[PDB]
């Protein structure tokens, strides 16, 4: 599926439970894996609007080339049946991270 070889750290604490579940099932049903912890093996980190990242986390993300994205990256990729350009879904783009 479109998320093959993708490992998503999910930081989506403030999403409704139904949406958290749907993000997870969208990821798993389309070849991806997810974790709630950020580690070097993560390829992506999904951040809802109300979640933020520490400087420590941002440093880890830079070092390990993790893509920061919003939930829309998942929703839209699923809708379009195609892995989209993750650079257009980066909440920390304003910081150039």
Residue numbers in the entry: 4 to 100
What does the article say, verbatim?
PARP4 is also referred to as vault PARP since it can localize to the vault particle, a cytoplasmic ribonucleoprotein complex. Collectively, the study establishes the human PARP4 BRCT as a nucleic acid–binding module.
The BRCT domain was crystallized using sitting drop vapor diffusion. Molecular replacement phasing of the diffraction data was realized using the AlphaFold predicted structure of PARP4 BRCT domain. Crystals of the BRCT domain diffracted to 1.75 Å and belong to space group F23 with one molecule in the asymmetric unit; the refined structure has a crystallographic R/RFREE of 0.175/0.188. However, there were several regions that required significant manual adjustments, and the final refined X-ray structure relative to the starting AlphaFold structure yielded an RMSD of 2.0 Å (comparing all 751 main chain and sidechain atoms). The major differences exist in loop regions connecting the core secondary structure elements, for example, the residues connecting strands β2 and β3 in the central beta-sheet. The Thr420-Gly421-Thr422 motif in PARP1 is Ser38-Phe39-Ser40 in PARP4 and thus not highly conserved. Candidate regions were identified by examining the electrostatic surface potential for areas of concentrated positive charge that might engage the negatively charged backbone of nucleic acid. Indeed, the BRCT exhibited similar binding to each of the vtRNA, indicating that the BRCT domain alone is capable of mediating nucleic acid interaction.
